[PDB]
Amino acid sequence: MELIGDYSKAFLLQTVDGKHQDLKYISPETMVALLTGKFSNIVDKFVIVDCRYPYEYEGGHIKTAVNLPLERDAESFLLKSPIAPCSLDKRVILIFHCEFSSERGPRMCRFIRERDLAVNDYPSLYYPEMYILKGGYKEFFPQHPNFCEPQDYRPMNHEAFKDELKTFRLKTRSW
Ligand SMILES: [Cl-]
Ligand SMILES: [Cl-]
């Protein structure tokens, strides 16, 4: 298979098929392998980027995940001061996901690569290796609830949060 974004090495994780044919998807089991340290000797740091709206995140998310639904906040958190590994031997990996990991997640993943390319001299990148969690939180929760907190799932279209949805969207750069 191809090398990661900066052509330095091969992708570390096993992938599964996903809608966006050019993106790399991983399963909930692989996500757990990362969380349980199965790759601790190679992966120095990995960040789980939850791109769902705040109320969805507050209703239940993956342990250690960071809520970065707005592009400007994701850019600030990831690129203002790039997350670097302990050594040049270990990797830094990003995992993006949303509710179904169908639209918001893939979009943010593409946005970050766009910005990474912009601030680098080809072919270097701060985040050469990025994946999308197949199925999003919706499929992850029913499989590994004890790796979530709180142990619940609040859908974007939850009936009691229609106002929260509108309030948040009016904060986005484009719709
Ligand atoms: Cl998909
Ligand atoms: Cl935005």
Coordinates of C-alpha atoms and ligand atoms in Angstrom, one line a residue, residues 69-73 108 168 171-174, ligand 2:
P69 CA -16.5 20.9 15.5
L70 CA -15.5 24.3 14.1
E71 CA -12.7 24.4 11.5
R72 CA -11.1 27.4 13.1
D73 CA -10.9 25.7 16.4
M108 CA -12.5 18.1 8.8
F168 CA -24.2 26.0 16.7
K171 CA -21.3 29.7 14.2
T172 CA -19.9 27.8 11.2
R173 CA -17.9 29.4 8.4
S174 CA -20.0 27.8 5.7
Ligands
CL2 CL -16.6 25.9 10.7

